[PDB]
Structure 1
Amino acid sequence: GSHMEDFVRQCFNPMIVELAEKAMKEYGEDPKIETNKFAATCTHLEVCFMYSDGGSKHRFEIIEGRDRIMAWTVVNSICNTTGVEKPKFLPDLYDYKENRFIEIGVTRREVHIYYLEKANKIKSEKTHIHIFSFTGEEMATKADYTLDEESRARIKTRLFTIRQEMASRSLWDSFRQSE
């Protein structure tokens, strides 16, 4: 029974916690041992959900949070509908407004290193990339941050609140030196 797991359950939405647990167990990792990964997956899930909530009521198709098979099914449908290229790796969202898959990233480094890694992994940069950080920084492909600055500011504020709570529980240091 870690302090990090209890904090993750006390701070995040129950559906988010349940989805993070299912996702981690799908790839063979236990939320009760890899607690920093647990908090990281919960944070990524919440950030993608807030992102999809931004903009119109039906602009984004959510890809993260589904089962791997069903998410791949939804991306297959999206591509075979809109003609976009089938991404080599599973993204997080799809923008119907801009007709492009979005890979959302939350990092405890600089936006530069995580963005370079994600882009190196993306190869053919058809999928848009958008990186948020726990210090309020963000970086999107071609400086196209997709949403207006109010929702992105709401996401940054949520990230910093999570960070402050972790630090007040003295769990921020181990959470930072783990990515």
Structure 2
Amino acid sequence: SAMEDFVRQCFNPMIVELAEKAMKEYGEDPKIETNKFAATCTHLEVCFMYSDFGKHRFEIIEGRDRIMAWTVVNSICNTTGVEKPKFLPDLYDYKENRFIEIGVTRREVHIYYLEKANKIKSEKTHIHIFSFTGEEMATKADYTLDEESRARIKTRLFTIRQEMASRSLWDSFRQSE
């Protein structure tokens, strides 16, 4: 399909391999579940960009194998005393000393924020939701990053959406969330 071609042209090889790895784990084929494949790559890219905007302020948890992800979380919990999350989060903020859950949505940021908060129920893990429309929602409206870094993320996401549009893939994608 066009979707795999788009994914391999707009995402970096590492991200693509990571996303394919995740999918091969669940039991899903990136050539059938093409919209899921794109969402995994998009969310991975956002996580990595978030981390790279940080002396390293953020520890990346997402994109690691579960064994290693929970090793990182456990080490952080034992050195900081911060409580252990029930679900693997996406980053850890050493400056603000808190785990962060990153959401990327094709819907309205508030619907997805409510969904993530209801899902985690761990009042400690900070939530940051980004849209493909340049909108964001974050716990206590603490957006953590500076304006330019958040702007770079927003620009990239809008750019992915428009690349999908030029290829007639956006409509399927936004209805597949």
SS at match of 1:58: coil
Q: Percent identity?
A: 99
Return the alpha-carbon distance in structure 1 between the equivalents of residues 22 and 66 of structure 2: 9
Return the alpha-carbon distance in structure 1 between the equivalents of residues 123 and 28 of structure 2: 30
SS at match of 2:43: helix
Question: Per-residue deviation at 1:120?
Answer: 0.2
Return the alpha-carbon distance in structure 2 between the equivalents of residues 18 and 5 of structure 1: 12
SS at match of 1:136: coil
Query: CA offsets per residue over residues 80-100 of structure 1, 9 Å max, x none?
Result: 110011000000000000000
Which consecutive unaligned segments of at least 5 residues does structure 2 have? none
Question: Per-residue deviation at 1:124?
Answer: 2.5
Query: CA offsets per residue over residues 57-102 of structure 1, 9 Å max, x none?
Result: 5111000010011101110111011001100000000000000000
- Larger CA deviation: 27-36 vs 75-84: 27-36
With the length of structure 1 as denominator, give the TM-score of the two structures: 0.97
Return the alpha-carbon distance in structure 2 between the equivalents of residues 113 and 70 of structure 1: 31
Question: Per-residue deviation at 1:33?
Answer: 1.0
Question: Per-residue deviation at 1:27?
Answer: 1.8
Question: Per-residue deviation at 1:161?
Answer: 0.5
Equivalent runs, 1:10-159 vs 2, <5 Å: 10-55=9-54, 57-159=55-157
Return the alpha-carbon distance in structure 1 between the equivalents of residues 84 and 30 of structure 2: 31
Question: Per-residue deviation at 1:49?
Answer: 0.6
Query: CA offsets per residue over residues 90-126 of structure 1, 9 Å max, x none?
Result: 0000000000000001000001111001000111211
Return the alpha-carbon distance in structure 2 between the equivalents of residues 164 and 128 of structure 1: 29
Return the alpha-carbon distance in structure 1 between the equivalents of residues 27 and 150 of structure 2: 32
Return the alpha-carbon distance in structure 2 between the equivalents of residues 78 and 95 of structure 1: 10
Return the alpha-carbon distance in structure 1 between the equivalents of residues 67 and 35 of structure 2: 26
Return the alpha-carbon distance in structure 2 between the equivalents of residues 115 and 147 of structure 1: 18
How many correspondences in the alignment? Answer: 177
SS at match of 1:88: coil
The runs of at least 4 consecutive aligned structure 1 residues that moved more than 3 Å come to none
Return the alpha-carbon distance in structure 1 between the equivalents of residues 114 and 158 of structure 2: 23
Which consecutive unaligned segments of at least 5 residues does structure 1 have? none
Match of 1:9 in 2: 8
SS at match of 2:160: helix
Return the alpha-carbon distance in structure 1 between the equivalents of residues 25 and 67 of structure 2: 11
